Amino acid sequence: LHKEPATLIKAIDGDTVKLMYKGQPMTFRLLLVDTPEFNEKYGPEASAFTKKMHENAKKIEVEFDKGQRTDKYGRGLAYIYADGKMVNEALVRQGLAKVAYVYKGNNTHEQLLRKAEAQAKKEKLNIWS
Ligand SMILES: Cc1cn([C@H]2C[C@H](OP(=O)(O)O)[C@@H](COP(=O)(O)O)O2)c(=O)[nH]c1=O
Numbered sequence: 569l570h571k572e573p574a575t576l577i578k579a580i581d582g583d584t585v586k587l588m589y590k591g592q593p594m595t596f597r598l599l600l601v602d603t604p605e606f607n608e609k610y611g612p613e614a615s616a617f618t619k620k621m622h623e624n625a626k627k628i629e630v631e632f633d634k635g636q637r638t639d640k641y642g643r644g645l646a647y648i649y650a651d652g653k654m655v656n657e658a659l660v661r662q663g664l665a666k667v668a669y670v671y672k673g674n675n676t677h678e679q680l681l682r683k684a685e686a687q688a689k690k691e692k693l694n695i696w697s
């Protein structure tokens with residue numbers, strides 16, 4: 569896998585964000601995670617976390633996996649990095665997303681994320697409290 573450039577257009581929620589990628593506006597859905605909807609418990613906290621991590625970043629990068637690059641809703645499916653830190657992982661490590669939606673052929677970082685989830689759960693953070 570490889571990282572490619574993008575720039576923030578707008579935060580959306582815990583696990584979706586509007587980025588400019590190859591010069592086009594796209595909504596990205598973070599691979600391998602599920603944040604609560606804004607209206608659900610920890611949803612505002614997830615949305616805030618993702619917004620801050622993107623907005624504070626000097627450099628945003630997207631990393632597609634090996635399989636499908638867009639979902640059925642036209643959303644890009646990627647791992648997103650903010651100054652080299654993976655947002656998807658960081659959310660899970662903080663107990664603000666569950667590992668989820670692990671489809672065969674786009675699951676390169678599954679084990680990394682499951683390790684983060686286990687540590688979040690051990691710490692009883694957020695969702696796991
Ligand atoms: C993360 C992810 C979601 N999806 C689809 C599955 C779910 O379909 P359904 O809408 O039919 O439930 C939906 C979940 O996204 P959200 O968690 O953003 O709602 O997005 C994919 O197809 N591939 C993916 O990698």
Ligand SMILES: [Ca+2]
Nearest residue numbers: 602603604605
């Ligand atoms: Ca969600």
